[PDB]
């Protein structure tokens, strides 16, 4: 028969759809898992969707994935109450069976599910407390701790009066009665979490709003025979904006940094006032630009802007990246606009920070001395850079830093003797030629 | 203007001993409404 055929692989594929969704169920996938689960017929695979949750809960590989699982149950119970209705039934029977079997591993797997379902308003507090009464009737104290650690946060909010009475009888256990040792420190740990106010049992996937979850708080008790509907999981036979072309937000902020800059006396004073502002990290690249441009209005270098920038760098590392991004942005892009009177300010400015290790020598590896990849104003900037390196450190201390720099931009050694002839010619034009003794040895071997 | 400036205050008991550096700022001039009035020292290029 082809209708019994066509309904069977329909029953197979629905079974072969839910089982990989449940295995791929995790946080930040819950809504995507629930969307694809909604298009497959949940109502026909009613016990299929329930059994694939119970076994994936029971398997002991999980226990971690239970709050992802119980959040999907709330998504189903919000959509279809009958799905969370039946799935609340089986977990009652799965507890009462394994409590009678004394399967302590399988009991705790179910009780973590029943806890988080109570965290998501799926089940009532009556079904929770009566389980607690059965566990506290015997010892069963390994199980009741993992329940009340997770659900007692919500449970004291809802039904405080009986929940005080659960605590009071549970307190009578430790104090007036003898207990086994390994169990005992876990029970008083619950009293320790009590004074920490349950802040480590109150984290889950509250995706549904309290009015988005249709409130089907199933008020079943664990003293009801719950119909054990295994039979529907078998196979049967259905005969059935304004565009922003201006930057007035930036101009007002650009005014405020400039007013801060001109209202201070010393460099530590302006450094204080900038750090007082708590500038956001997107603007901290732009604040460095405002400092440097206003350092070019001065018409002379000042030690103000150095010790301004030094207190920036030692404060927090995002300032230090902001100068390192700006020094590349100045050399690769901004040299073409700057006059030679502004280059002697910048070459003395960046030469001050490099010579006192606020910027590393590795930032100088970006700068390369060729005929093609050099600007005539770029050669001016390097010349005013190295003089401040020579004046502060000395000629021998600069020799040590350039040897530890291992850069190729100023120092070609591997070949290309037209660049070696270029680099000796450029450095001796600056006035520093003592460092070029490495290149002249390399040059005459090529000849 | 010359006194709308945070004045450095640092530990007069130990400032006579050594150079402490600028560790705290004393307020120079106040008003109910904040204005960051610039000071001339910025506007006069330095001797060195």
């Amino acid at each position: 028969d082809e209708d019994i055929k066509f309904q069977r692989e329909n029953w197979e594929m629905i079974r072969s759809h839910v089982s990989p969704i449940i295995s791929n169920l995790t946080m930040d996938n819950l809504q995507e898992s629930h969307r694809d689960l909604f298009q497959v017929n949940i109502l026909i695979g009613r016990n299929i969707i329930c059994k694939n949750v119970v076994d994936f809960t029971l398997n002991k590989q999980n226990g971690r994935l239970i709050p992802a699982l119980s959040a999907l149950i709330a998504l189903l119970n919000s959509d279809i109450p009958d799905i969370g209705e039946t799935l609340a039934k089986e977990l009652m029977l799965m507890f009462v069976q394994q409590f009678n079997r004394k399967d302590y591993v399988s009991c705790g797997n179910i009780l973590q599910c029943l806890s988080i379902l109570f965290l998501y308003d799926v089940i009532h507090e009556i079904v929770i407390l009566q389980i607690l009464l059965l566990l506290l009737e015997k010892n069963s104290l390994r199980l009741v701790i993992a329940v009340m650690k997770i659900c007692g946060w919500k449970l004291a909010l809802v039904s405080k009066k009986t929940h005080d009475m659960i605590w009071e009888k549970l307190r009578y256990i430790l104090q007036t009665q003898e207990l086994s040792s390994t169990l005992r420190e876990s029970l008083e740990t619950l009293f320790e979490i009590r004074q920490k106010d349950y802040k480590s049992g109150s984290q889950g996937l509250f995706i549904l709003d309290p009015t988005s979850y249709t409130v089907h708080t199933h008020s079943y008790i664990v003293s009801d025979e719950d119909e054990a509907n295994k039979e529907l999981g078998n196979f049967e036979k259905c005969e059935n904006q304004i565009y922003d072309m201006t930057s007035t937000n930036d101009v007002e902020f650009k005014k405020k940094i400039y007013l801060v800059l001109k209202s201070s006396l010393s460099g530590d004073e302006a450094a204080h006032k900038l750090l007082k502002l708590k500038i956001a990290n997107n603007l901290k690249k732009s604040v460095v630009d405002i400092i440097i441009k206003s350092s070019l209005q001065e018409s002379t270098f000042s030690k103000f802007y150095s010790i301004l920038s030094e207190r920036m760098i030692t404060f927090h590392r995002s300032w230090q990246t902001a100068y390192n991004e700006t020094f590349e942005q100045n050399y690769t892009q901004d040299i073409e606009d700057y006059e030679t009177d502004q280059l002697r300010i910048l070459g003395k400015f960046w030469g001050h920070l490099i010579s006192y290790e606020f910027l590393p020598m590795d930032c100088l590896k970006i700068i390369k001395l060729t005929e093609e990849e050099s600007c005539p104003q770029g050669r001016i900037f390097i010349k005013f850079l190295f003089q401040e390196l020579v004046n502060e450190l000395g000629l021998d201390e600069l020799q040590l830093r350039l040897n530890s720099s291992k850069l190729d931009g100023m120092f070609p050694l591997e070949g290309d003797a037209e660049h070696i002839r270029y680099s000796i010619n450029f450095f001796t034009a600056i006035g520093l030629g003592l460092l070029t003794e490495d290149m002249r040895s390399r040059l005459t071997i090529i000849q | 203007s010359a006194s709308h400036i945070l004045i450095p205050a640092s530990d007069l008991s130990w400032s006579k001993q050594t150079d402490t550096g600028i560790t705290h700022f004393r307020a120079g001039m106040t008003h109910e409404d904040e204005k960051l009035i610039p000071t001339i020292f910025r506007y006069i290029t330095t001797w060195e």
């Binding site: 530590d268 | 205050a9 550096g21 600028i22 560790t23 705290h24 700022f25 004393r26 001039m29």
Partner: peptide, 27 residues
């Protein structure tokens, strides 16, 4: 707190005596 920094009084100071820690000088 008044950790040896500040003024004996803001009376003859002609200031407010307001003292704030230098965020620049830390290390």
């Amino acid at each position: 707190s008044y950790n040896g920094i500040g003024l004996k009084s803001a009376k003859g100071s002609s200031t407010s005596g307001h003292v704030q820690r230098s965020l620049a000088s830390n290390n």
